[PDB]
């Protein structure tokens, strides 16, 4: 039988608990906020990316715009350069991460993702392109920029670019080719012996086609065959919404239907060479 | 009596080493919280008033989307479930891992809290939902746009699951204390919201019906108990915000107990404050997964 | 002499606190860079909680 209480261990524990509860309350206040999202949308808004640049925005990234005739505002990627030019980007290819075999509604409404860094693939949506490019008495321009698999880039410019309403199947229109070292694939290409191939591969005045909404000049279905949505003729010489091929080079054996269905621009590279990157972007013509 | 200073000495020496371990654990986590977790949720091009319009516009994958219910409302992020049933589901509540504190005050429940979505593997978009509460102002606005249905789904720790579908669902505004109404029940989880707890009877069951209740948080008492003492509150400190009566048959916003089973002596205030659906598992089982999703009714 | 066997009261406070801290640390996984991988030994708490009431009978 021994007589030792000690018991300071008990009281020292109670005090250690009361102090621990203080530490626990302090940790709670540090775990209230969510994960920080690197993706933010800018505050400045306007009719388009040029209007936004005119209001003093200097950074390329994500912005809401609302053309006058638009019922609601919508998000876009704006490219803003050191000279106050604000490009509204409506198409981007970069790495093959997004499937471009999409239907009429999907091409109408848009698909893919928008990034502040401009490092994502997307189609903005035909309805939006139509709204931006048909603002009352504001001539627009389109720039197509292409990158090959060896880091070379080229461009093609089209003056008075317009995309028509859904009632005219989002018809592509422009007044003239305004130059650029990629050449004018929208004028079609003289591929071979057939005297009508250049006429049937041009894109000016072509209605938009998807697999489920065929508005091309072919007995068959260009968009279904080539797995895309595009302003098809019979069928194409520039085809930026085509299948992404790693390394550029592909062949008839690469495809289910036997046709050139890659990301092509026939005036710059053979139709069996598929671009590493493409950008389709629009700006008021007077900025050029 | 002689063999009493043996175990009673080792019990206290066990506890003091347990306080040292907890002291270390809390401290280590505090260092981790010097910097936040991050996401990079690049935004789908496709948008609409909510997730139903989005799926009608061809947005067919479950992920984060930006929606703008009204031109007067600032566009905001939500997780859209495009795969469950017919898709078009706007997630308003989600629990899956206890990564978010749901024991929050009135303003956080008003504004929304938690993580809408996170990045999966090496993808440049957020296709996995986080734990979050969308926010009462936003939930009220969405349900009041037109007839709205509600899908509540839950899963236990063995992988079994049930659901509670309410064909009609409305949440009134702040002025009306975010009052809830539900009807047209069907499912497997049991009609906790309309019928109260299935294990109770009479008055005691009736006082667990959530239908018609106001929202309360632990700093804003709007529950069924009208007694003027701070001891009688359904939502106590670090308790979830919910449509409490006296008090509940269900609390999706309860505390996340790991493993499911918990007891009164594990609970902060000795109450059944877990992620509960009494009509399925009882008061002392805490769900592994719990979520709430709404959609325009057709 | 001193029959302060209220160590069963401190044992109850520790069980709640262990669980409460487990929940709170877990709620940091959605806030902070890293989440501390840890557990709660309810078995160890109940094994020695089965005692005390055993040695006081």
Swiss-Prot record, chain A:
Record GO biological process: blood coagulation, fibrin clot formation; cell-matrix adhesion; fibrinolysis; negative regulation of endothelial cell apoptotic process; negative regulation of extrinsic apoptotic signaling pathway via death domain receptors; plasminogen activation; platelet aggregation; positive regulation of ERK1 and ERK2 cascade
Superkingdom as given in the UniProt entry: Eukaryota
Keyword Magnesium: no
Annotated phenotype, changing residue 171 to H: In DYSFIBRIN; fibrinogen Bergamo-2/Essen/Haifa/Osaka-3/Perugia/Saga/Barcelona-3/Barcelona-4
Sequence segments annotated as region (Gamma-chain polymerization, binding amino end of another fibrin alpha chain): 270-288
Domain Fibrinogen C-terminal: 40-286
Expression sites by tissue: Detected in blood plasma (at protein level).
Outcome following mutation: residue 197 to H: In CAFBN; hypofibrinogenemia; heterozygous; no effect on fibrinogen complex assembly; no effect on fibrinogen complex secretion
Entry binding sites for Ca(2+): 214, 216, 218, 220
Outcome (variant: residue 204 to I): In Baltimore-3; impaired polymerization
Note: The gamma-chain carries the main binding site for the platelet receptor.
Involvement in disease: Congenital afibrinogenemia: Rare autosomal recessive disorder is characterized by bleeding that varies from mild to severe and by complete absence or extremely low levels of plasma and platelet fibrinogen. Dysfibrinogenemia, congenital: A disorder characterized by qualitative abnormalities (dysfibrinogenemia) of the circulating fibrinogen. Affected individuals are frequently asymptomatic, but some patients have bleeding diathesis, thromboembolic complications, or both. In some cases, dysfibrinogenemia is associated with low circulating fibrinogen levels (hypodysfibrinogenemia).
Name of this chain's protein: Fibrinogen gamma chain
Biological source species: Homo sapiens (Human)
Parent-record interval covered: 131 to 418 of 453
UniProtKB/Swiss-Prot annotation, chain B:
Biological processes annotated in GO: adaptive immune response; blood coagulation, fibrin clot formation; cell-matrix adhesion; cellular response to interleukin-1; cellular response to leptin stimulus; fibrinolysis; induction of bacterial agglutination; innate immune response
Recorded GO MF terms: extracellular matrix structural constituent; protein-folding chaperone binding; signaling receptor binding; structural molecule activity
S-S bonds: 41-126, 51-80, 234-247
Tissue distribution: Detected in blood plasma (at protein level).
Post-translational modification: Conversion of fibrinogen to fibrin is triggered by thrombin, which cleaves fibrinopeptides A and B from alpha and beta chains, and thus exposes the N-terminal polymerization sites responsible for the formation of the soft clot. The soft clot is converted into the hard clot by factor XIIIA which catalyzes the epsilon-(gamma-glutamyl)lysine cross-linking between gamma chains (stronger) and between alpha chains (weaker) of different monomers.
Annotated keywords: Adaptive immunity, Blood coagulation, Coiled coil, Disease variant, Disulfide bond, Glycoprotein, Hemostasis, Immunity, Innate immunity, Pyrrolidone carboxylic acid, Secreted, Signal
Glycosylation sites noted in the Swiss-Prot or TrEMBL record: 204
Effect of residue 6 to C: In CAFBN; fibrinogen Longmont
Subcellular location: Secreted
Broad class of where this protein is predominantly found: secreted
Result for mutant: residue 175 to T: In Pontoise-2
Domain Fibrinogen C-terminal per the UniProt entry, residue ranges: 42-298
Disorder association: Congenital afibrinogenemia: Rare autosomal recessive disorder is characterized by bleeding that varies from mild to severe and by complete absence or extremely low levels of plasma and platelet fibrinogen.
Subunit structure: Heterohexamer; disulfide linked. Contains 2 sets of 3 non-identical chains (alpha, beta and gamma). The 2 heterotrimers are in head to head conformation with the N-termini in a small central domain.
Name of this chain's protein: Fibrinogen beta chain
Gene (name only): FGB
Part of the whole protein covered: 191 to 488 of 491
Curated annotation (Swiss-Prot), chain C:
Tissues where the protein occurs: Detected in blood plasma (at protein level).
PTM note: It is well known that heterologous expression of isolated domains can lead to adventitious protein modifications.
Domain of life: Eukaryota
Compartments it resides in: Secreted
Function of the molecule: Cleaved by the protease thrombin to yield monomers which, together with fibrinogen beta (FGB) and fibrinogen gamma (FGG), polymerize to form an insoluble fibrin matrix. Fibrin has a major function in hemostasis as one of the primary components of blood clots. In addition, functions during the early stages of wound repair to stabilize the lesion and guide cell migration during re-epithelialization. Was originally thought to be essential for platelet aggregation, based on in vitro studies using anticoagulated blood.
Quaternary structure, from the entry: Heterohexamer; disulfide linked. Contains 2 sets of 3 non-identical chains (alpha, beta and gamma). The 2 heterotrimers are in head to head conformation with the N-termini in a small central domain.
Disease implication from the record: Congenital afibrinogenemia: Rare autosomal recessive disorder is characterized by bleeding that varies from mild to severe and by complete absence or extremely low levels of plasma and platelet fibrinogen. Amyloidosis, hereditary systemic 2: A form of hereditary systemic amyloidosis, a disorder characterized by amyloid deposition in multiple tissues resulting in a wide clinical spectrum. AMYLD2 is an autosomal dominant form characterized by deposition of amyloid preferentially in the glomeruli of the kidney. It clinically presents with hypertension, proteinuria, and finally azotemia. Involvement of liver and spleen may be seen in advanced cases, but heavy glomerular deposition without significant medium sized vessel involvement is characteristic of the disease.
């Amino acid at each position: 039988s021994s007589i030792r209480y000690l018991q300071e261990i008990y009281n020292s524990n109670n005090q250690k608990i009361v102090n621990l509860k203080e530490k626990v309350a302090q940790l709670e206040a540090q775990c209230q906020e969510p994960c920080k999202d690197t993706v933010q949308i800018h505050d400045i808004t306007g009719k388009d990316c040029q209007d936004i640049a005119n209001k003093g925005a200097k950074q390329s990234g994500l912005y809401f715009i609302k053309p006058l005739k638009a019922n609601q505002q919508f998000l876009v990627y704006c490219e803003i350069d050191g000279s106050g030019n604000g490009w509204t980007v409506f198409q981007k290819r970069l790495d093959g991460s997004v499937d471009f075999k999409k239907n009429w509604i999907q091409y109408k409404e848009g698909f893919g993702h928008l990034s502040p860094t401009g490092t994502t693939e997307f189609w903005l949506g035909n309805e939006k392109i139509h709204l931006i490019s048909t603002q009352s008495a504001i001539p627009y321009a389109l720039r197509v920029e292409l990158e090959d698999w060896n880091g070379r880039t080229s461009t093609a410019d089209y003056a008075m670019f317009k995309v028509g309403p859904e009632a005219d199947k989002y018809r592509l229109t422009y007044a003239y080719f305004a130059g650029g070292d990629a050449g004018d694939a929208f004028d079609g290409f003289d591929f071979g012996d057939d005297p009508s191939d250049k006429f049937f591969t041009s894109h000016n005045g072509m209605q938009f086609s998807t697999w489920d909404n065929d508005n091309d000049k072919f007995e068959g279905n260009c968009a279904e065959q080539d797995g895309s949505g595009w302003w098809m003729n019979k069928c194409h010489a520039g085809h930026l919404n085509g299948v992404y091929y790693q390394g550029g080079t592909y062949s008839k054996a690469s495809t289910p239907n036997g046709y050139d269905n890659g990301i092509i621009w026939a005036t710059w590279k053979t139709r069996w060479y598929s671009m590493k990157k493409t950008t389709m972007k629009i700006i008021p013509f007077n900025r050029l | 009596i002689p063999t009493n200073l043996r175990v009673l000495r080792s019990i206290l020496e066990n506890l003091r080493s347990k306080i040292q371990k907890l002291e270390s654990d809390v401290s280590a986590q505090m260092e981790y919280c010097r910097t936040p977790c991050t996401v990079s949720c690049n935004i789908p091009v496709v948008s609409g008033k909510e997730c139903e319009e989005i799926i009608r516009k061809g947005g067919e994958t479950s992920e984060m989307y930006l929606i703008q219910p009204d031109s007067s409302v600032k566009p905001y992020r939500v997780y859209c479930d495009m795969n469950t049933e017919n898709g078009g589901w706007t997630v308003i509540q989600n629990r899956q891992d206890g990564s978010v504190d749901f024991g929050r005050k009135w303003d956080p429940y008003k504004q929304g809290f938690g993580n809408v979505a996170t990045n999966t593997d090496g993808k440049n978009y957020c296709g996995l939902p986080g734990e979050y509460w969308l926010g009462n102002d936003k939930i009220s606005q969405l349900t009041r746009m037109g007839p709205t249905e509600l899908l509540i789904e839950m899963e236990d720790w063995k992988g079994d699951k049930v659901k509670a579908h309410y064909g009609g669902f409305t949440v009134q505004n702040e002025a009306n204390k975010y009052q809830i109404s539900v009807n047209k029940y069907r499912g497997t989880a049991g009609n906790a919201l309309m019928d109260g707890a299935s294990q109770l009877m009479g008055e005691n069951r009736t006082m667990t019906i959530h239908n018609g209740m106001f929202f309360s948080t632990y700093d804003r008492d709007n529950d069924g108990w009208l007694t003027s003492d701070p001891r009688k509150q359904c939502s106590k400190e670090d308790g979830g915000g919910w449509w409490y009566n006296r008090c509940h048959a269900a609390n999706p916003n309860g505390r996340y107990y790991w493993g499911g089973q918990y007891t009164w002596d594990m609970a902060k205030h000795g109450t059944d404050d877990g992620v509960v659906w009494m009509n399925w598992k009882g008061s002392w089982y805490s769900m592994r997964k719990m979520s709430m999703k709404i959609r325009p009714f057709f | 002499q001193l029959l302060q066997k209220n160590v069963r009261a401190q044992l109850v406070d520790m069980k709640r606190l262990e669980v409460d801290i487990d929940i709170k640390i877990r709620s940091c996984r959605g806030s902070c860079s890293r989440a501390l991988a840890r557990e709660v030994d309810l078995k160890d708490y109940e094994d020695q909680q089965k005692q005390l009431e055993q040695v006081i009978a």
